[PDB]
Symmetry: C4
Subunit: 164 residues, 4 copies
């Protein structure tokens, strides 16, 4: 795989199946998958920071990013390519050293510019075709984990090393 210095990810439709739960009181939910925490685990084990880029803006995602010790959190993002470029500039890397996973229209410009692009199997066809690696899983199934494990070449020997 390409040398990756930063992993960036969308939330809805990647860390979730796109589900947006609404009640009668103005409250809102998302359903995360505990499996995706291993994505952060493996990135951090390799010395790679992870950032969230999302167009939504919620306390739900603030809490999840905190629980998982995600390095960067940008919400209400209107232009994900610009946000990514700006963070790359701050970090001293280029987009070719970024791996980004996203599933929809607001992800497309960024997906086309990154070193490794991932798109869940549940995504619209014209977004899926931008993926540069195959991902088997759908949003919310542990596809963030699947993406990280492939991008970083996590293998049986890595597994054995961590559970000793």
């Amino acid at each position: 795989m390409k040398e990756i210095k930063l992993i960036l990810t969308d939330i809805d439709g990647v860390w979730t199946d796109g589900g947006m739960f609404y009640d009668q009181t103005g409250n809102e939910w998302k359903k995360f998958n505990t499996s995706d925490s291993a994505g952060i685990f493996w990135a951090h084990n390799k010395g790679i920071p992870v950032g969230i880029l999302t167009g939504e803006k919620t306390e739900i995602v603030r809490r999840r990013a905190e629980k998982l010790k995600v390095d960067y959190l940008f919400q209400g993002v209107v232009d994900k390519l610009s946000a990514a470029e700006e963070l790359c500039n701050e970090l001293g890397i280029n987009l070719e050293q970024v791996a980004y996973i996203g599933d929809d229209l607001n992800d497309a410009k960024l997906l086309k510019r990154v070193g490794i692009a991932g798109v869940p199997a549940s995504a619209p066809f014209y977004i899926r075709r931008l993926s540069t690696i195959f991902l088997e899983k759908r949003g919310g199934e542990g596809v963030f984990r699947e993406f990280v494990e492939k991008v970083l070449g996590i293998n049986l020997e890595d597994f054995i090393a961590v559970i000793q």
Copy 2:
């Protein structure tokens, strides 16, 4: 696809998988799919209003229709066909210029009177067979998006034009 001037949609079993969540206190939830918001995006991009016709009546749905800037919302509807015909009069257009998607008994009469009828793959067979185009997706899987994209013939060229 015929010149459509209005897209109408049911909620439960279309925008959702029919799930109705109840707690112990009289609160209630629905689970929407973020993918469907693209259905409103594509409709608006092409100059077409979207309207919701639902037999239920909840703040859940009012909040979702607001978020998505849906043009028309009718809840607690007893007779969807007549509600459609009214709106067609209010707006000065014909049932023939309407695309409607629904999934159950209360949708049947209207489905039979519109220019393009859509029914999710998850619907009962006698409603399914009313559909005039094939929809692959189940309620809550982004089938509203699928419908709008088929109805408006959204293609790769449209995609390339909106993500520049």
Copy 3:
């Protein structure tokens, strides 16, 4: 299809996929499927009452049962066969004229004794073999609707009748 005078049903694993949602405060949810309402619709269309027999006892099911105008609701039932029999006596009918659908251990004695026993596809093997008709659907998938439609011989002619 035998003559049926009473339709009875379990809740968890039939009207739901067995899901029991718990929060941090002692509240609880279940997820119903709007499709199952049509089961009550068709039963009432044929002049057949429906009763709920459940071992759990929740406000959740109280509120759902009332919304659907279910005819009998028995919760915290420990002996479902005895409860059915008592109900049969009230209506002057026998077990051979009852159709019951259930998915688990607390249902087996009753399933064995009714005129038509239905068990969702999702149920344990040793319960599924008690079913006297085949049901395709899993719990929470509209399997109560499937059951009623099969039991009452609901066909396309019935459908055309009710929308016309």
Copy 4:
């Protein structure tokens, strides 16, 4: 099947599909499956205690364990192998007389040391390959029940005997 004197279980990804529901207010949900209660029923029927070992710590799980009358609950466990050894030491039990089911990295060391290891079909491959029996079911689908019934050899004869 070997002699089993204690069944131990992880929660997230075994008792659930890994789902972690967050709202806007700091509350949290898990979705259990009523099917898994039969896991406890059969263990207790055979006189075998059940213990939960989870890395998470929530009222959600405390309440669930209490309602199911689970014999031991350990939350916020950082080293499951050690927690299992200490519980076993109190009870007089060898790890070879234990059946444990788990799905992720924090379960691997203990899975490798128990008499029967179970892993849901939904788990990562490097965990699933530690399983010493085949489990068909995914987390949240009643795979804890499947595990219990397999390891205790629950068969049609037990089912016939337990319903009179």
